[PDB]
Every structure is written in structure tokens, then in C-alpha cells.
Design a protein around this nucleic acid. Structure first.
Ligand SMILES: [Zn+2]
Lengths: 49, 210, 49, 345, 48, 52, 47, 210
DNA sequence: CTTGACAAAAGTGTTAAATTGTGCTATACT
DNA sequence: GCACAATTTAACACTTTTGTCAAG
């Protein structure tokens, strides 16, 4: 198996917390009307009902 | 001077004069009054616990209850240093023990921002002064600057020990949060004794409503 | 209260700029400041009990 | 209290009249030239005789017994010089006392203008050096201004001194300050950037943007460079910062440990190190060895084909094929037993 | 307005201060994008 | 409660150390000085007086 | 694997406690059954 | 490998602490602002406390347990487990000896009871304020000879080692009715408005005419 | 298991670019 | 705040080792 430079950094919902998804709000920096912390490309925000 | 002719008949500091062609002597006694931890170290290093023992013994049998009491409460500590077999001069430290890195961690968290213990900054702001001083004691600087610079050493060192037992505790600039020193970790409710020894979080456990 | 006590910290940042530089050419546009006030309010609206 | 202390100790000495000042610099430089004339006599170094003067002035054996565990031998390289310069005619002798008093006056000068230095460092608070600590680093910047001064220039020592006070102070704040270490130019360049930020935020009234702030900075500056150095700007975070609305909580304990193996990880690496052993047993004797010689399972170090071939006596070509058939031979047993099909992350 | 003490020259020139959070309809501000509230305080009144 | 009280009185103040190496007013435990005097009586030396 | 749990040794909070005391110029020595030196840090701080 | 039934506690001495330390932390720096590696002498420096990574020297020439404990000839780091950084301490060599605030400000104050001083006086003494006598060398203060353990101040100290001197102000244009280097008496006039307060040798200071 | 032929990878040496460490200026100002 | 020596780094020309292929 090829050892890829990149590894999985993903975000999996914690235990006991489960449901559906009623929201998608992703704000990447350099976008209009959004200022992001220095050293941060983008940020993703999901809602769970 | 004068190849064995004029000779001062009194103690004192001698003063050379190129203009008035005179060796004038100013009345004074060469005394060693040294002020500081160095002097205290001298005394403590010259002390005879044995002498003071056999002396305080005779001192304690004095009829007056007061003197007898102070003599007791003195020979107490003396005897401690006797039976223990420890020298009091060690109480004046020349080499400050530095605590290991993982004991005073500095590590980055999510987002990238860093973090560090207060004892790090303490152990740093110490070396700064103890260094500048070492440069001054070399390059020939006036006693005022030395006595003051050396003062901030005795206080900084103590700040890394018990911070707050003297004056307003040193805090990171801009914040009122006192720096935690060596003694700050031990004593106290949440200290390394009560929270990390006589009780601790465990493995294989959990909880819920009843 | 926090606005005024925070504004006095600006008043001092005023009295240190005028007393030096070029006392002839000056405008409050160079004599005022944001942070002594801005941070003063931002502090209250968060950390206070 | 050390604070009032220093102030009162410097308040124990008068300053200087213009006369006293000019005279100070005069005698000081007369001593500094006196030593220079002594170097041409007994044939010694410029600084040798110089320091040895302090060895009889600045104190007794206390000056050479603690400049560190090593500075320069006191009874050897000095005492011989304290007597080597001792036998000289009346012509050369005076130039010694001029060195003692000349170098002496220096101290007077420093002590005098000390009431200046302290009042200088006074407007620099906030650097992260509380007064005395800040003032001290400035006092040494007086010692530089002194020995390099020139009375001949008919300039009040104040002007020359002040600049060397600000130099030293601005040097310490870039060499200490923040918990982490920051090379000097970069520390300054930060200050330059913030200096611009608070400026055009003042003119335009609204805070700038990473692009325009860099625009007003100069050539080569872009929207990224400013944010780039801005990341490095911010310092660490106190691990003692209380989290939550309580008084019993900290920020330190909220940090895990990755620098140490977890029990599940020890058991994991154990299962791999075991299952691989038994899975190794099912191979040809030569290839079973050669296999763990190419993966560094033996001495921990990896052995190239050139070494393996020299180990058995074959070529670097044979070993190569040996590995090919090896791994692929365990392939068959693994595609079955499925014991090691795991550990795939 | 910045005015000279001697020159008698007047210089006004409006400037900027900062950003002051505004209260919503319900009565709770928004700090750092979070909905917070300012609870009332109580202490003895000034005087003799 | 009794246990606690017992721990409350378990220290005595020395009066006339006697032939012991103790000192006047050198406060120590109960059992300690007890065993001290115990041996001292056997060694022929004079015991130590004390106040609970 | 089923074997009964071994016998633990250093709580490790205590080791840190001891080193923290060492930073105070406090010599903390562990003994055994007869007034004898016991190394609680295996080959670590020995120098 | 041996039972642990007893735990002692003593006073560490400087020469002992020197034995503890694996190095003297010189540079009061944490880490590089870029490489995030411990600074050359930094308080986290691997070269003394230990490797940040298991069985790897800094430069990375010895990367495996094959070489264990062997000190690197390039970086200078001992190849071993990265856990050693929790138990390997440092030390800082002080130019001027200092005391431990514990014994100083402690309720009975050990160093205070030994030396037979008071917490109030030993306070200024150790903190570089008032001098303390050591071997008076036949000295005297206000008629009563000073002895060891006594506490002096700046004035009296210099007054006994540098002698006593009295400055007299002269308003411009006025002259001294006394010759330079001539012996004056208390109460005697040196100028029309200048009155000598001590017997001794007066001296001109910055003459305005010749 | 074995040669010879090769390209990719890992060395080894000298440079151009950059990054960092330093001394310093002069109306006066204590 | 700046001219600049000091030292580090990325830059790159190029040599040698090491994985590798078609054929014995
Ligand atoms: Zn190495």
C-alpha cells in the first residue's frame, strides 16, 4: 500500500450525538464579507437535528 | 613615600596626588561590612553548631523563663542541623536547579496556537538578570548598578520559588494572573498533592442517572 | 463607566503624542487612538461577570 | 520595595554642573590615554593594563574571583603585571595614577547621568520588562555612551547618552519580550507593520484589509506576507488560563499526550510484531532471513541488496528476486488466514 | 477639535473611535458572534 | 470520638529532662517519652517528668 | 490475553512530584528495608 | 528490584545540584520562531535534557536502538528514549549566591534563628539595603566600637572605610580666607559666609581665578 | 541463480539568496 | 532605524550508489 504523504484529518461526530443534517455553512477565507484568523484557509460548520 | 622618609603614623585610606605632590592619608578603618546573601553565606559557613550547642546548653539553664525559652527554640534548629548532618550554607544556593522540559511543557494545540507553563517564563526572566549581571561584574561597572541588578536576582530567584510571599507577584504583562512557582504547585487545594496524589481520575469507569 | 474609564486611557494616549514630534503640524487625526477604547469595551462585553 | 529603592539610591547623588561634566570627560580621557601610553612602555596590551587597574580599584580579589568560573588568572596573569608595571621611573609612574583616577571618574560620570537613564526608560513601560528590569538594560547603554564620548565636540553629554540609552532598551525588547525568540530585524518589521495598521485604520477610520495594509507598506508587500508574519507575531498562551465560568478549571489539563504510547497502541504493535513472526516462519530459510534484513527487522537498520548478497554470497540480483518471491509468497497465506489483513488504518 | 494654546489657531477635523456593540430587540447583544446578555448588578447607593 | 480524643492528648511537654538527652520544654509524644523512661529506669538513670 | 494484572510500580505523578521537589533544592531519597538508596528512575537521571 | 519502605528528605547542596544537572541553561530562549527546535542552550534544549524523539540524535546520524546511549559526535545528543526529558534536570550558575525564600520568610525562619537575627533586619540585610559587620578591624561608631553581627548603613559604612568629608558651597565672586591644603578647625571660617564644621584639611574645588 | 546496461535516487561539492546578528548616530533632555 | 558583516539555507552542477530489466 502506497504510503501517501497526506493523512486523514477529518471530523467525525462524537458518540451519543446522532441525527440528521439541516445545515451547511462553509466560509472559506478571501471570500466577501468574511474575515478569517491568520493561518486558516477555510472553516466548515454543520448543524445536527 | 619619598624613598623611606615620610611615613604615616595612622590607619586609613591612602590618596595619591600628582598636582600637590603629597601622599595624604584619610582616617578610616578598613572594615568588611559586606551586605547581601554573600555575607549571610559567610556567617552561615563559619558557624559552629557544636560551640553554639554547648553554649546554648548553659544558656538554657538560666533561671529566667524567657531567655531559657528563646534558647530552647534556638538550639532546636541547631540540633536539627546536628542530627541531620546537613550544612546550613546550602540554604544559600549557588546553582539553581532547572526543572525538565516535559515537566514544564510547551506544546501547540488545534488552530496552531501555542501554550506554555508560567514556570517557564519565571525560569527565563531569572536567567536574563543573572546573565546581564555576569556581564557587569566583568566589564567593570559601578556599585550602584551592581547592587540593584543583583537585588532583582535575589527577588527573581525567589519568584521562581514562592511567588507572592514577597510583594505583588509577577504576572505576564497585561494580565493579573499570578505566575505559578514551585511552591504554588505543591500547596493548595488543586495542588500536585491533593489533586494528583491523594485522588485522581481513573481508567475503566463512567457514570449516569439513577 | 467602562467607556469613560476606558476613554481616560485614551486621554493619556493623547497627552503623550502632542508633547513631541511636530507641535505645529498636528490634527486630532493623528492624536487619538482606537485600542485604548476599543479594547476597553471588548473587555467588558466578554470577561465581566 | 526595590522600586523606590533604586530611585532613592540614585537620588543620593547630585547630578553635575557643566564644569563638572567637561572636567569629568577630560580626566577620564586622560586616563584612557595614560593606559595607552603605558602599553608603549612595559609593552603590554591596551585592555590588559586597563582591567588590571580595576583589579586594584574596582576591588580586591572579588573582581576576578567571579566573572564566571573562568575569566583570566588573578594570581598569575595579573599579579605579575601588578609588579611588572611597579618598577618604572617617575616618568612612567604618574601615567599609572592617571589611569587609576582617570578610569575612576568614569564611574562618577555614569552615576551622575544615571538620574537621566532612569527617567528615559520611564516612557518605555509596557515592553514586558517592569521598570527596574527595563531601566537596568538601559543603564548599560549608558556605559557604552560614556567610554565613547568626546568632550571636545562641545556637546552636552545628554544628547550622546540618550541615543545609547534608547539603543540598548530597544535592543533588549527585541531580544527578550515575547516568550519565544525573535531575530531582531523581524521583531522590528512586526512593529513597522502594526505601526502602519493603527495609522491607516486611523485615517480611513475603518480597519484595513490584508491587501491595502500591505499596499501602504511598500514594494513586494502582498496580502499574504502581512498575515504571514502576523501569524508569527502572536505569542504563546498561558497554560494557567482558567476555562469556563468556574474557578476550579484550567487550560493545561485539557491537553492530551501524543508523545507516549497508549496501552492499546502497545498491544497493537505487540500483535503486529507477533503475528508477523509466526507469519514469517512459513517461508524459505534464506528468504526468511533476507526478508528481515531488507526491512531492518534484525539490527534495526536496513541492509541494501549489496550487503545481503555479501551475507549469503549471492549477487545483488539474486537477493532482489528473493524478495519478490518472498513477499508474494506470504501474499497467498495472508489472502487466506486474514489474520494480518488488519492494521490497514 | 485640536487647538493651539498660543497660536490661537483652530483645527477641528473629525476622527474615528472604534466599534460599539448595539443591543438587539429582545435586549441581548452579540459578542464574537455569540448571543450573550448583560445581567443587572447591585451595590449600596453612594452617600453618607 | 474516643480515638480522636486520644490523638488529641498524645503529646506531652517535657519538665526536667533528667538524665535524658532531651531539653526542658521539648515537646514530644506520649508513647515515646514513656518508652524512654522505661529504658532509663533499667539503665539506672533518672527518668523524665512531663505534663500532658 | 487473560493473565492476571501484573504488579504496578511508579504512580508517575509521584516521580514528577519528586522532581518538582528537586527543583526546590530538596533532596528526596527513597529507601528500602535498611537505610539504603533506591533508584526510582531506571537509568534515567543517573548521569 | 528492591522493596521501598522509607522516604527521606534533606537539603540539597549546590555541589549536589551540579551533579543532578545535565547542563547549564545559558541562553534564556525557548525555541526558534521557525524550526520550533530547542535553542542551542534553550531551557528545552535536547542536547542536555534529551531527545524529542525516541532513539534519535538531533542531527539524525544515529537513528536506531542499535546505538544506545552513545553520545553524538556531531549534535552532542545522547541517543535514548524521549522519556528521559521528564527526569533530567538542569541548573543555572549564579554569579552572586542567593538564599531560598522559604527559610527566609518562614514563620520561625530557620536562617533567622541560626544566625540569631530577626526577620525584620535579616530582611534588609539579605535584600541589599543595610550592611552587616564582619571583623570590624578595630572600628568605632559614635563612640561605641562596632562589633560583628551589627548592622550599618551606607553613610556610616563609607564613613568608616572612606572617611568623613564636608562640602561647603561658594557663591560666585567670593574667595576663601583660608589657603589651599591648609588645616582648619570646627567653627573656623573658610569664607565670609562659610563655617567649618570639622577639624581637618580643606581643599579648593574648581577655582575661578589665578 | 548471473551479467551487463541504465535510469532513478541519493550523494557530494561549490554558490547565490536570505536571514540574522551588531554597532551606532552628537542641540538638549539628569 | 539602518548599513553590513556573519552565518545559514536553498540552489544546483554533477558523481556514485542502488533499485531494476532482458537474457543467460
Ligand atoms: Zn547526531
Amino acid at each position: 500500500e502506497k504510503a501517501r504523504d497526506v493523512k486523514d484529518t477529518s471530523l467525525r461526530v462524537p458518540p451519543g450525538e446522532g441525527g440528521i443534517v439541516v445545515g451547511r455553512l462553509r466560509l472559506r477565507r478571501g471570500d466577501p464579507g468574511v474575515e478569517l484568523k491568520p493561518g486558516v484557509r477555510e472553516v466548515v460548520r454543520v448543524f445536527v437535528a | 613615600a619619598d624613598g623611606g622618609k615620610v611615613k604615616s603614623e595612622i590607619y586609613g585610606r591612602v590618596e595619591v596626588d600628582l598636582v600637590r605632590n603629597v601622599v595624604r592619608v584619610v582616617e578610616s578603618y578598613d572594615i568588611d561590612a559586606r551586605m547581601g546573601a554573600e555575607a549571610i553565606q559567610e556567617l552561615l559557613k563559619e558557624l559552629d553548631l557544636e560551640k553554639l550547642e554547648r553554649e546554648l546548653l548553659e544558656e538554657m539553664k538560666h533561671p529566667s523563663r524567657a531567655r531559657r525559652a528563646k534558647a530552647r527554640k534556638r538550639l532546636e534548629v541547631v540540633r536539627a542541623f546536628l542530627d541531620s548532618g546537613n550544612r546550613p550554607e546550602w540554604m544559600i544556593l549557588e546553582a539553581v536547579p532547572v526543572l525538565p522540559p516535559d515537566l514544564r511543557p510547551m506544546v501547540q494545540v488545534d488552530g496552531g496556537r501555542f501554550a506554555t507553563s508560567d514556570l517557564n517564563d519565571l525560569y527565563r526572566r531569572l536567567i536574563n538578570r543573572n546573565n546581564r549581571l555576569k556581564k557587569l561584574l566583568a566589564q567593570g561597572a559601578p556599585e550602584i548598578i551592581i547592587r540593584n541588578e543583583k537585588r532583582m536576582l535575589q527577588e527573581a530567584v525567589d519568584a521562581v520559588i514562592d511567588n507572592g510571599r514577597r510583594g505583588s507577584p509577577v504576572t505576564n504583562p497585561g494580565s493579573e494572573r499570578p505566575l505559578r512557582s514551585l511552591t504554588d504547585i505543591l500547596s493548595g487545594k488543586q495542588g500536585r498533592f491533593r489533586q494528583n496524589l491523594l485522588g485522581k481520575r481513573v481508567d475503566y469507569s463512567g457514570r449516569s442517572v439513577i | 463607566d467602562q467607556f469613560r474609564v476606558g476613554l481616560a486611557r485614551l486621554a493619556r494616549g493623547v497627552r503623550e503624542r502632542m508633547v513631541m514630534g511636530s507641535p505645529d503640524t498636528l490634527t486630532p487625526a493623528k492624536l487619538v487612538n482606537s485600542r485604548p477604547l476599543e479594547a476597553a469595551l471588548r473587555e467588558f462585553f466578554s470577561r465581566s461577570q | 520595595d526595590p522600586v523606590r529603592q533604586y530611585l532613592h539610591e540614585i537620588g543620593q547623588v547630585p547630578l553635575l554642573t557643566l564644569e563638572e561634566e567637561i572636567d569629568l570627560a577630560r580626566k577620564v580621557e586622560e586616563g584612557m590615554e595614560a593606559i595607552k601610553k603605558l602599553s608603549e612602555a612595559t609593552g603590554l596590551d591596551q585592555e590588559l593594563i586597563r582591567e588590571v587597574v580595576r583589579a586594584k580599584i574596582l576591588g580586591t580579589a572579588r573582581i576576578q574571583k567571579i566573572p564566571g568560573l573562568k575569566e583570566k588568572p588573578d594570581p598569575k596573569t595579573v599579579e605579575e603585571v601588578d609588579g611588572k608595571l611597579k618598577s618604572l621611573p617617575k616618568e612612567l609612574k604618574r601615567y599609572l595614577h592617571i589611569a587609576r583616577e582617570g578610569e575612576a571618574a568614569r564611574q562618577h560620570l555614569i552615576e551622575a547621568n544615571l538620574r537621566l537613564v532612569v527617567s528615559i526608560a520611564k516612557k518605555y513601560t509596557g515592553r514586558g520588562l517592569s521598570f527596574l528590569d527595563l531601566i537596568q538594560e538601559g543603564n548599560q547603554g549608558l556605559i557604552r555612551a560614556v567610554e565613547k564620548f568626546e568632550y571636545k565636540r562641545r556637546f552636552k553629554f545628554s544628547t550622546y547618552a540618550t541615543w545609547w540609552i534608547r539603543q540598548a532598551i530597544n535592543r533588549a525588547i527585541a531580544d527578550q519580550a515575547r516568550t519565544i525568540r525573535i531575530p531582531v530585524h523581524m521583531v522590528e518589521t512586526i512593529n513597522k507593520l502594526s505601526r502602519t495598521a493603527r495609522q491607516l485604520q486611523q485615517e480611513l477610520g475603518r480597519e484595513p484589509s490584508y491587501e491595502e495594509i500591505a499596499e501602504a507598506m511598500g514594494p513586494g508587500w502582498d496580502a499574504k506576507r502581512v498575515e504571514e508574519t502576523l501569524k508569527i507575531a502572536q505569542e504563546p498562551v498561558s497554560l494557567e488560563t482558567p476555562i469556563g465560568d468556574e474557578k476550579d478549571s484550567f487550560y493545561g489539563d485539557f491537553i492530551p499526550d501524543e508523545n507516549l504510547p497508549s496501552p492499546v497502541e502497545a498491544a497493537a504493535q505487540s500483535l503486529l510484531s507477533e503475528e508477523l513472526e509466526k507469519a514469517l516462519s512459513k517461508l524459505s530459510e534464506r528468504e526468511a532471513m533476507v526478508l528481515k534484513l531488507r526491512k531492518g527487522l534484525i539490527d534495526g537498520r536496513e541492509h541494501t541488496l549489496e550487503e545481503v548478497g555479501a551475507y549469503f554470497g549471492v549477487t545483488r540480483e539474486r537477493i532482489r528476486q528473493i524478495e519478490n518471491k518472498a513477499l508474494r509468497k506470504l501474499k497467498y497465506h495472508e489472502s487466506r488466514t486474514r489474520k494480518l489483513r488488519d492494521f490497514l488504518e | 477639535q485640536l487647538i493651539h494654546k498660543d497660536t490661537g489657531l483652530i483645527k477641528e477635523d473629525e476622527v474615528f473611535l472604534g466599534h460599539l456593540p448595539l443591543m438587539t430587540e429582545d435586549g441581548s447583544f452579540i459578542i464574537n458572534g455569540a448571543d450573550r446578555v448583560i445581567v443587572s448588578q447591585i451595590h449600596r447607593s453612594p452617600g453618607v | 470520638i474516643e480515638i480522636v480524643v486520644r490523638q488529641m492528648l498524645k503529646y506531652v511537654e517535657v519538665t526536667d529532662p533528667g538524665d535524658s538527652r532531651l531539653l526542658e520544654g521539648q515537646v514530644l509524644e506520649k508513647w515515646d517519652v514513656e518508652a524512654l523512661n522505661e529504658r532509663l529506669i533499667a539503665e539506672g538513670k533518672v527518668p523524665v517528668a512531663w505534663k500532658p | 490475553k487473560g493473565e492476571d494484572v501484573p504488579e504496578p510500580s511508579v504512580p508517575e505523578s509521584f516521580r514528577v512530584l519528586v522532581k518538582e521537589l528537586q527543583a526546590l533544592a530538596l533532596d528526596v531519597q527513597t529507601l528500602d528495608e535498611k537505610d539504603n538508596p533506591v533508584d526510582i528512575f531506571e537509568g534515567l537521571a543517573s548521569k | 528490584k528492591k522493596e521501598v519502605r522509607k522516604v527521606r528528605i534533606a537539603l540539597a547542596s549546590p555541589e549536589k545540584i551540579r551533579s543532578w544537572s545535565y547542563g547549564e541553561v545559558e541562553k534564556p530562549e525557548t525555541i526558534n520562531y521557525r524550526t520550533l527546535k530547542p535553542e542551542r542552550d534553550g531551557l528545552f534544549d535536547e542536547r542536555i535534557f534529551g531527545p524529542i524523539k525516541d532513539y534519535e540524535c538531533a542531527c539524525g546520524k544515529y537513528k536506531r536502538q542499535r546505538f544506545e546511549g552513545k553520545v553524538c559526535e556531531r549534535c552532542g545528543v545522547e541517543v535514548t528514549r524521549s522519556i528521559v526529558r521528564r527526569y533530567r534536570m538542569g541548573h543555572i550558575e549564579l554569579a552572586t549566591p542567593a538564599a531560598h525564600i522559604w527559610f527566609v520568610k518562614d514563620v520561625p525562619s530557620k536562617i533567622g534563628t541560626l544566625l540569631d537575627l530577626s526577620a525584620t533586619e535579616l530582611e534588609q540585610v539579605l535584600y541589599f539595603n543595610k550592611y552587616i559587620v564582619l571583623d570590624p578591624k578595630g572600628a568605632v561608631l559614635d563612640g561605641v566600637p562596632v562589633e560583628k553581627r551589627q548592622l550599618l548603613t551606607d553613610e556610616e559604612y563609607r564613613e568608616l572605610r572612606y572617611g568623613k568629608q564636608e562640602t561647603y558651597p561658594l557663591p560666585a565672586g567670593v574667595d576663601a580666607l583660608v589657603k589651599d591644603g591648609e588645616e582648619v578647625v570646627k567653627g573656623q571660617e573658610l569664607a565670609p559666609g562659610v563655617v567649618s564644621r570639622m577639624d581637618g584639611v580643606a581643599l579648593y574645588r574648581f577655582p575661578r581665578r589665578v
